[PDB]
Design goal:
The complex is a heterodimer. By secondary structure, chain A is mainly β. Chain A is built from no helices and five strands. In chain B, strands 2, 4, 5, 6, 9, 10 and 11 form a seven-stranded mixed β-sheet that branches. In chain B, a hairpin with a 7-residue loop joins strand 5 and strand 6. By secondary structure, chain B is mostly beta strands. Classes of the chains: A mainly beta, B mainly beta. The interface between A and B is medium-sized, with 17 and 25 residues. Strand 5 of chain A pairs antiparallel with strand 5 of chain B. Bound molecules: nickel (II) ion (9 copies).
Chain lengths: 61, 127
């Protein structure tokens, strides 16, 4: 499958992960403003992180 | 094989409550204790699957999203193999399909996925 991986508001980039049918967009606030980490798969997550898992290509924007 | 069965969907009047539950078939040995079992909410076109609650033995991987904090609560019967999500003071904004998922362990990816159950809060006529 295909999914984004750029961090926060850097230009949209892609990462191809064959077979991985889900994707993720994690958001935590932190000291340095809203940080965002996108990637492949649907990961279990520590406390206080906005997780959003997704099912189509390049949908974790 | 592990397969996740949900139960408890339907229509709730605004302000009511309702308990979803997700039973992890497979691992019938009942040694799934640490499956990080997650509840996600899909509001159709708006947003994909939003993690609303995550249940693990590991504290850092057992919490609820701040949006629903105080209204939703998760429970676990590891022996009976069930992970329940009780929803109180249900608002219309909570109308969505709630899906269950299971990761093999804390920090691993949600590789198991559920059927989905609709929850509708509206107070309007159902025909
Ligand atoms: Ni594809
Ligand atoms: Ni491929
Ligand atoms: Ni895109
Ligand atoms: Ni959302
Ligand atoms: Ni603790
Ligand atoms: Ni604790
Ligand atoms: Ni907590
Ligand atoms: Ni409202
Ligand atoms: Ni850890």
């Amino acid at each position: 499958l295909e999914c984004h991986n750029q961090q926060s508001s850097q230009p949209p980039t892609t990462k191809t992960c064959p077979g991985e049918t889900n994707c993720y967009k994690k958001v935590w606030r932190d000291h340095r403003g809203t940080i965002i980490e996108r990637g492949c798969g649907c990961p279990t997550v520590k406390p206080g992180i906005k997780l959003n898992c997704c099912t189509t290509d390049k949908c974790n924007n | 094989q592990v397969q996740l069965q949900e139960s408890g969907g339907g229509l709730v009047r605004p302000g009511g409550s309702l308990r979803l539950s997700c039973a992890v078939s497979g691992v019938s040995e009942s040694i799934f204790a640490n499956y990080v079992v997650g509840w996600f909410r899909q509001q159709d076109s708006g947003t994909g699957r939003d993690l609303v609650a995550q249940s693990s033995s590991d504290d850092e991987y057992n919490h609820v999203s701040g949006s629903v904090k105080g209204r939703f609560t998760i429970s676990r019967d590891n022996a009976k193999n069930t992970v329940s999500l009780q929803m109180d003071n249900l608002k219309p904004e909570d109308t969505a399909i709630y899906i269950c998922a299971a990761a093999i362990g804390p920090g691993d990816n949600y590789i198991y996925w559920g059927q989905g159950t609709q929850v509708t809060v509206s107070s309007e006529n159902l025909y």
